[PDB]
Design a protein around this ligand. Structure first.
Ligand SMILES: Nc1ncnc2c1ncn2[C@@H]1O[C@H](COP(=O)(O)OP(=O)(O)OP(=O)(O)O)[C@@H](O)[C@H]1O
Ligand SMILES: [Ca+2]
Lengths: 55, 367, 75
């Protein structure tokens, strides 16, 4: 159960991350208002740690 | 501050013309009016350095890459003092040189892993200097890839030496007035044979000038001279420091590499040989572990039966104490122990004053 | 597999990518993890090796009426 909650914690955060800022009673206005080389460096960084981890 | 450099250093010129084609290796529209077997010094003209500067590679880079042109007949002390003093490079606790032709566009994956894992990390831990061909070709290219890869996973300084003639896009380098900044077409599309660009992994470059448009081996004499001088040099606080150890790493190659090691061995420079490197490297490893037979198979058939190679091997074995062989141990992936074992063996002393450098490395590495 | 490295890759014999290409294919089709590891370890240019035809061969090597075959058949 502890692991399951920790996993569901993400689903909660994502749900509220995209929710409009205003509260339900005032959410109406928000609805109305609604209507490269670094990556290569990063990947290399990942691989090095993987290689070290396996070794 | 750099105004001293042009006076101190000179760029050689072919000058005299020796037999369309020219033995001087610089067939131009017309050799000078002043202009047999062409000689490096007999048929050359020394002129003040006209290509010193700090390269700034186009696109991504550190915008800091010292580029200098110098004659082969130059004292290693001057360059070392300039590097240590002017460019601000710290005195190296260790300097390791890489040699070998490294035949083929790419090397074996395990060997590359050994290079990047062992050599680079060891140098980074102790802040050693890695000196290789200053060209994005062959062995030098592989080292640069290793250094680049290690840098991405973060520095390590790795100077480079290459003949001036073989360099590509030398126009941007040529600047008698000096080029504190400089744009280099390192992404040279035309792989025009001998002409090569400069790998941008290396922090500094030495363009050996010998009055040629491009040739191999011109930097060997200067290379060995610099290694010997550094080997006989103290780090920090002038002489109050300790000797800077030096090790030569050979990976495959040809008789030229065999000549280099023999000269290095005569120079009392410890050498290390990697098992499985290939021709010009496996033969010596076997000998440490008939001689004509190995030259036939271990070395290329051309000149393999020639006893000149066998004679060099005998001379090489004559001072086998200085050199040693790094057994891959089925890919050991660690060689700090091997390097230390080599240096202590090469010391051959007992005063314990010459072992401080080895001790420091032993401390720097966890061994 | 240990025998192959001990004998076939004792170092007394050179090797070529084309020499090992067939063996590699067999190991992949026969699920020989140790061998494929060993063959790749011997400096095999995998990128220059793999071909779309070879890739098709591998997928064709699915076991009998394996689930993957059903998906491939539907595809
Ligand atoms: N002096 C150099 N000359 C050429 N390539 C260099 C040099 N130093 C490092 N490199 C790297 O070596 C590789 C050269 O080959 P190439 O450019 O074809 O490969 P790449 O990384 O796939 O990039 P590209 O898109 O330019 O083809 C590149 O990664 C380039 O970044
Ligand atoms: Ca010493």
């Amino acid at each position: 159960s502890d692991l399951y909650w920790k996993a569901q914690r993400y689903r909660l955060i994502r749900e509220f991350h995209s929710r409009p800022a205003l509260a339900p009673p005032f959410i109406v206005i928000s609805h109305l208002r609604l209507l490269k080389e670094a990556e290569r460096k990063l990947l290399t960084w990942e691989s090095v740690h993987k290689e070290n981890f396996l070794l | 501050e750099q105004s001293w450099i042009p006076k101190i250093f000179k760029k050689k010129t072919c000058t005299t013309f020796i037999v369309t084609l020219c033995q001087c290796g610089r067939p131009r529209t017309a050799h000078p009016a002043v202009a047999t077997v062409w000689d490096s010094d007999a048929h050359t003209t020394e002129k003040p350095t006209d290509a010193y500067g700090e390269l700034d590679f186009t696109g991504a880079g550190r915008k800091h890459s010292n580029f200098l042109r110098l004659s082969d007949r130059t004292d290693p002390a001057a360059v070392y003092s300039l590097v240590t003093r002017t460019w601000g490079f710290r005195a190296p606790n260790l300097v390791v040189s890489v040699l070998g032709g490294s035949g083929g566009p790419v090397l074996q994956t395990w060997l590359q892993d050994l290079l990047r894992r062992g050599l680079v990390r060891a140098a980074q831990s102790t802040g050693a200097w890695i000196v290789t061909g200053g060209l994005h070709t062959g062995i030098g290219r592989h080292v640069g890839v290793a250094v680049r890869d290690h840098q991405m996973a973060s520095k390590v300084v790795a100077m480079g030496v290459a003949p001036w003639g073989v360099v590509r896009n030398r126009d941007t380098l040529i600047n008698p007035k000096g080029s504190f900044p400089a744009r280099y077409r390192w992404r040279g599309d035309p792989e025009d044979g001998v002409q090569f660009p400069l790998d941008y992994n290396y922090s500094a470059f030495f363009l050996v000038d010998d009055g040629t448009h491009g040739c191999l081996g011109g930097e060997n004499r200067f290379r060995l001279r610099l290694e010997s001088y550094i080997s006989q040099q103290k780090t920090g606080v002038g002489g109050t420091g300790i000797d800077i150890p030096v090790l030569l790493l050979l990976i495959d190659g040809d008789e030229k590499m065999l000549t280099r090691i023999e000269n290095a061995t005569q120079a009392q420079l410890p050498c290390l040989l990697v098992a499985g490197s290939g021709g010009a490297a496996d033969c010596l490893a076997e000998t440490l572990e008939q001689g004509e037979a190995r030259d036939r198979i271990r070395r290329f058939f051309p000149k393999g039966d020639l006893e000149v190679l066998q004679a060099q091997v005998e001379r090489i074995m004559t001072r086998k104490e200085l050199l040693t062989v790094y057994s891959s141990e089925d890919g050991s992936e660690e060689f700090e122990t091997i390097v230390l074992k080599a240096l202590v063996k090469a010391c051959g002393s007992s005063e314990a004053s010459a072992y401080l450098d080895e001790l420091r490395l032993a401390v720097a590495w966890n061994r | 597999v240990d025998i192959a490295q001990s004998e076939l890759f004792r170092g007394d014999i050179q090797w070529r990518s084309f020499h090992l290409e067939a063996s590699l294919m067999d190991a992949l089709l026969n699920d020989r993890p140790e061998f494929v590891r060993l063959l790749i370890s011997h400096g095999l240019s995998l990128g220059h090796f793999l071909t779309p035809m070879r890739l098709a061969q591998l997928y064709s090597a699915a076991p009998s009426n394996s689930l993957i075959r059903n998906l491939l058949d539907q595809a």
